[PDB]
Symmetry: C3
Subunit: 118 residues, 3 copies
């Protein structure tokens, strides 16, 4: 039995995708970006939205087994890591962080995916 | 019990990988590129090949819970989204779309992965 | 019941993540880079570390269903493929290989993720 979470955004509309999908104990979360002027704020906001999507799929951050982080400037990995650490210091999912040339819009500095179990 | 799908390509040969693998209800699909001259045609063809690989693993597009899209020019996200939407408007897996510097060959404009359940 | 593997590195410290996590039959492995001067050596070393993390989570390379490979120069895909092939010629998980602008440090030429089942 499959459940899906939508945020009502046009982008989900134009591309045909969900914020989160749950089947069995698996919950997957879409690449998520954040509001905010700088990389730290955007990371916090991206993680807040992941939590919101998770919670609507009956999951919490404690269920997250993997995150994947795309940044436009990996030299700023520490600003991003600090926020990920404040969110996942106990939980400690696996992650990756790689630099990409661009995200969907030029002001967007970080995008985060998540996989959760349970 | 594990089943694997091969397309017989040299690349699978040189790198040692499968188009799709199924164990339990999980089916994972390799990064897939498409034939065609422009981003729309390549997206459609990449999705056709994903379907073919899925079907050989006993799965359909309706089982897909996640896609991940790499593009060489994210300013063309709409051409790609339209095709993803025509394929997944009802199903609505989660996705991500990020721009990369290059794919395996210079004429290749888009690559798509998929995860499916069931 | 969840188990996690740590390597004791500062980076896991700063970012708050695990080398590997297992729940149920799933084992996910973090993006992994390798020591060594050139792309071949770094790929071999990245795969050795994946194996080590897997083994500490009760898994082997034969359980791997997916790898994902980030390289800084995809024109060198053959050097990387040869090593992946020597590791996975029989097993044949699905993969993807894409070029990124940078990894976490400038001398790092390849990063590999893995998903395993069982």
């Amino acid at each position: 039995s499959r459940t899906m979470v939508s945020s009502g955004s046009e982008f989900e509309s134009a591309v045909g995708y969900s914020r989160a999908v749950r089947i069995g104990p698996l919950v997957v979360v879409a690449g998520t970006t954040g509001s905010g002027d700088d990389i730290a704020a955007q990371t916090r906001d991206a993680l807040r939205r992941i939590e919101i999507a998770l919670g609507q799929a009956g999951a919490t951050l404690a269920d997250v087994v993997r995150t994947r982080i795309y940044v436009t400037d990996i030299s700023r990995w520490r600003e991003v890591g600090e926020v990920h650490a404040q969110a996942f210091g106990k939980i400690r999912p696996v992650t990756s962080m790689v630099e990409v040339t661009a995200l969907i819009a030029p002001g967007l500095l970080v995008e985060i995916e998540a996989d959760a179990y349970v």
